[PDB]
Design a protein around this ligand. Structure first.
Ligand SMILES: Cc1ccc(-c2cc3c(N[C@@H](Cc4cccc(F)c4)P(=O)(O)O)ncnc3s2)cc1Cl
Ligand SMILES: Cc1ccc(-c2cc3c(N[C@@H](Cc4cccc(F)c4)P(=O)(O)O)ncnc3s2)cc1Cl
Ligand SMILES: [Cl-]
Ligand SMILES: [Cl-]
Ligand SMILES: [Cl-]
Ligand SMILES: [Cl-]
Lengths: 341, 341
């Protein structure tokens, strides 16, 4: 808690250097490069950097300390920042698609005067910056191609999950029949879990010389399952999370989201309850949102969640027991600690 | 003309197989994959396939015929289609950013009922498909990493050029002071020339085992210069091209575009003419567009263009003379033939 959040400070320090090298004898693109700088400064800074940091922490846990020279650690910081750029790319584009107003407390980049739909290009640049950074810092390393493929695959999985989410939850289309458990698991796995949990550990593994298919598959089984719980808790806190403790106030119900809650509610609802949901879900009427929350409450979804979090915790510890070796279980336990608070 | 347009038929034939392999034991993403199929069918088909085809023609010219087996030609078709996907990605996103209505004769993908801003994700998928295809067909080839880097770099150059264009030509901002020759050359080089002319020949070169830095630099010098002329002629035809001969009718003036014409007009205009341009450029008033065309005409810009096309043709032939070897000059002359019509 005090040692993990020290490591956070150095992470954010490295950002200036990330930006410097991404923004260098080509005079008349200078103006585009200055715009690239604003995009990076506004969109890559101001999160909690959990994904990026995971690359750094894991790399330190997986390498023998007498192969951790200044250049080694530099590359770990940089590939951490690559994960944060991938995420910035997804967020900027996602906020346009959903018509969001704010992000990380502030006006979404695309809503800023003079940006608008130009944010589409800006997001594309954020994505491109990943591969410039990999080239600049890792091109001579034996894991180079492995990291390129990892990021590309992570992008594809995320885009695919996003497609599935958009089909499943059209804004302005009350359709609870799309909102099944199988479909919810599928969205979370592709859209969130691969890039948030598998990507950063996998990156660290490759940087450490652990490139085995089986080892990667073992780590993935643990990490996708943590990803699933992360999102489910995220859906629960959207509506039941003390809002001064989380940051946010939730709009999942308004937004016709395929949330963990609605899925559970629909497995439990009578025909009558189905209709209260059907009349009220995915509307912005405060009163219509009241009566969904109330339905969820009457059905003891908070209790169902707590039961789920307990079960999920034993399942995760079992998976770690079974699939962590020959990585140190600490690699996985550090992540479990941050999400099963 | 009859032999080049035969080779076009086989190109488009291969498309079905492209789509088949991109759309395969993961049941519950099936719906996303069906959406991927529509995106590909609507946006990758219906151009003239000049960029993709250039990969195939060049590959055939650069390889010894007794290393051109069925698998070899398969990979050339596929990397051709990769160039067409990159272009589909850029077009779909560009039409959103510019608020275009039609493309290749039909309603732009994003303007279609139920798509809208979801087209941002769809465009991202088109981009992703490139690297799936490279992996599926080229992962065992020694040029694999070279092609990945080439496409990534081509994407970055294009995005950068797009940034510069957006800064230079804000819709709803009469600013002729941004519209210099240096800035115009710079936009065309990054936004158009690298991916339209350098990318497909470079791809063919790598597939042929020609990976030399110097050879690539030599080919680039010819190909960027052809790219520049292509765009300049494109700007001329927007306004002076018989519209039944081109396909289109032009909206460069309306659109506050940094066209070759406005740049030239501004090097030639008196203070008085500057004001007619300043009052009339980048407005949708038919009469205001009349009076720009008329200014261009009074300044003999059609004559200036024809002089430019002649000069450009000698310059291109000189560059080919000087920089083509040891590639067959036919590689470059085939391209010159298609654009200096
Ligand atoms: C690998 C990894 C990737 C992402 C995270 C994240 C944690 C987190 C986050 N953590 C909160 C707790 C939390 C919020 C939502 C779901 C959850 F499981 C835990 P906090 O400890 O910042 O108050 N809040 C918002 N977004 C994220 S993303 C954590 C990890 Cl270990
Ligand atoms: C490598 C390469 C890449 C792109 C092309 C293109 C030709 C072309 C194109 N060609 C017309 C001619 C033309 C149009 C605009 C500029 C120009 F130089 C030539 P056509 O022969 O289809 O009537 N029209 C619209 N877009 C494109 S893109 C041609 C080549 Cl050789
Ligand atoms: Cl080193
Ligand atoms: Cl997977
Ligand atoms: Cl073979
Ligand atoms: Cl270059």
């Amino acid at each position: 808690s005090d040692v993990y959040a020290q490591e956070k400070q150095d992470f954010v320090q490295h950002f200036s250097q990330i930006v410097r090298v991404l923004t260098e004898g080509h005079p008349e693109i200078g103006d585009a490069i200055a715009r690239l700088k604003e995009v990076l400064e506004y969109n890559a800074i101001g999160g909690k950097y959990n994904r990026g940091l995971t690359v750094v922490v894991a790399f330190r846990e997986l390498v023998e300390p007498r192969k951790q020279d200044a250049d080694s650690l530099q590359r770990a910081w940089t590939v951490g920042w690559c994960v944060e750029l991938l995420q910035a790319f997804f967020l900027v584009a996602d906020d346009i698609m959903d018509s969001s107003l704010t992000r990380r407390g502030q006006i979404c980049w695309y809503q800023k005067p003079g940006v608008g739909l130009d944010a589409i290009n800006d997001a594309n640049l954020l994505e491109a910056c990943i591969y410039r950074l990999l080239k600049l810092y890792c091109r001579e390393q034996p894991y180079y191609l492995n990291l390129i493929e990892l990021f590309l695959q992570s992008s594809y999985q995320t885009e695919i999950g996003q497609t599935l989410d958009l089909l499943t939850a059209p804004q302005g289309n009350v359709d609870l029949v799309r909102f099944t458990e199988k479909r919810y698991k599928s969205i979370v796995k592709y859209k969130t879990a691969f890039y948030s949990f598998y990507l950063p550990i996998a990156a660290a593994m490759y940087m450490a010389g652990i490139d085995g298919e089986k080892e990667h598959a073992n780590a993935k089984k643990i990490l996708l399952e943590m990803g699933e719980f992360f999102q489910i808790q995220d859906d629960y806190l959207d509506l039941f999370g003390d809002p001064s403790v989380t940051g946010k106030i939730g709009t999942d119900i308004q937004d016709n989201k395929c949330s963990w809650l609605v899925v559970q509610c629909l497995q439990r609802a009578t025909p009558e309850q189905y209709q209260i949901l059907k009349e009220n879900y995915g509307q912005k009427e405060a009163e219509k949102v009241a009566r969904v929350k109330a339905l969820y409450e009457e059905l003891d979804l908070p209790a169902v969640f707590l039961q789920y979090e307990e079960d999920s915790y034993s399942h995760i510890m079992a998976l770690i027991e079974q699939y962590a070796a020959p990585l140190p279980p600490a690699v996985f336990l550090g992540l479990a600690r941050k999400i099963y608070k």
